[model samples]
Target: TITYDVFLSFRGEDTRFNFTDHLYSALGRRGIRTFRDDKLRRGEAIAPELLKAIEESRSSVIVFSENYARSRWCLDALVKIMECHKDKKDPGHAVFPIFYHVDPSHVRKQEGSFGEAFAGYGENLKDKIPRWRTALTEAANLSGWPLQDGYESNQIKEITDSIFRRLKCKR
Candidate 1:
């Protein structure tokens, strides 16, 4: 059975090469099987395979970058991730949110950059906006890692350490 220790949700344009890349490598080095989508965005809808990847993972890690909300794919994936984390029947399913160069307050309240990202959504996706907002608010409310200014490696270590601790206890 194919399974993953962590499912990574991130915006490619925002942190694909730097922050997310380092994080992914760090997780791999620790023997944490992480599922990250490397495919370029093709359409407006989220891929079924990505959703399946989320369900197969024991934990979901959301990297909420400055432009995270700008992509519909990220928002759609957030909705699904939150759903899986909140599932009453799914035991040991966890979620870890990382505010990468963004404030948790902004994410929860959809203020600042988050608010501006929504403004661009316009009337086209009015239906999905509310649910995306709800997902962001809920996920931000959870205990998560906030990347301190600079020293990103330190923050990454802290995050990986926390996840390692959880796996140790749970496994």
Candidate 2:
């Protein structure tokens, strides 16, 4: 059934090619079956295959960079994760959000720059906005790593370890 231990979701333009690549490699070294969409096919919508990946993965790691909320694709994926989280039996499908260069509240309240930009969209998007807010709020409630003003490899390792351990990975 192609069950994966982890699914990495992030803004490709922000850190997909770099940070996510490193993360995927690290998980691979640990022998974890991780799935990440690095090479999205051209002119394609968020296909059913990707949604299946999200549904089957044991956990999801969302790299919440500065420009992440700006992408409709990321927001949509976040909503799907929220839906998956609603099931009690599937609650083990954890979601770990990494605040790369933004604050958790910023996403929760849809405030700061994100709120400002979202305000511009018409009422049609308002419905989706609430879903986005819920997704961010729920994700923010989880234990995550914040990349404050500096990069701390130790902190990153600790967070990553916590994530893997929480998923109960034997290796």
Candidate 3:
């Protein structure tokens, strides 16, 4: 739903070749365009080319390693990665906030947030909003909710009624 369906931000030793590599391949196999450090980091400032990639992706996933915090390079990248993660939470699509919207997928794919919602999530000490994107059909799926969907509840009731009627007919 973006320049890339997903952006992968990860560490050099812990993941790239193992977790991220398989991840990159799977996304591509499924036809979800993806990008990773196999190209650039944060897709910006560090390398003009990388930044462009960051600007191009709709969202990024950071895979932190045990040693991820030890390297200055890793820290700088975390800064840039945070910015990229923030990009998904772009309030006006660039303001750099900390949260996602309530409706999720509330923003059109073209708007940039791509369904982002929230004012905070990362760095709770300073406190903040969440950074995210879509679900299914840009829905930002796999998440839970406050109240259940009316449609889902009704669908369950219909199935229950049918099962009940079948039991009544049993000898």
Specify the highest-TM-score model's number: 1
Candidate 1 clashes: the total is 0
Evaluate candidate 3 by giving its C-alpha RMSD to the native, one decimal.
15.9
- Order the candidates by lDDT, highest first: 1, 2, 3
Q: Can you give the TM-score per candidate against the true fold?
A: 0.94, 0.86, 0.43
lDDT top scorer: 1
- Cα lDDT of model 2 by residue, 1-171, tens digit: 438988888889888777777777777766678989866555434666678888888788888877778777788888887677676253357778888777878877777875565766578787777788788888878778777766545555666777768777532
Candidate 3: where are CA atoms >4 Å away? 39-45, 84-171
Model 3, span 28-85: residue lDDT tens: 5545556676644443225655556656665444443333333334344445555554
Error of 2 at 43 (Å): 5.1
Weakest lDDT window of 10 consecutive positions for candidate 1: 85-94
Once fitted onto the true fold, the runs of candidate 2 whose alpha carbons sit more than 4 angstroms away are 42-45, 88-91, 169-171
Candidate 1 C-alpha lDDT tens digits along 112-157: 9666999888888989999999999999999998785889888898
Select the stronger candidate by TM-score from 1 and 3: 1
For model 2, what is the error of residue 52's alpha carbon versus the real structure, in angstroms, after optimal superposition?
A: 0.8
Candidate lDDT values, in order: 0.88, 0.76, 0.40
| Model 1 spans with C-alpha error above 4 angstroms | 88-90
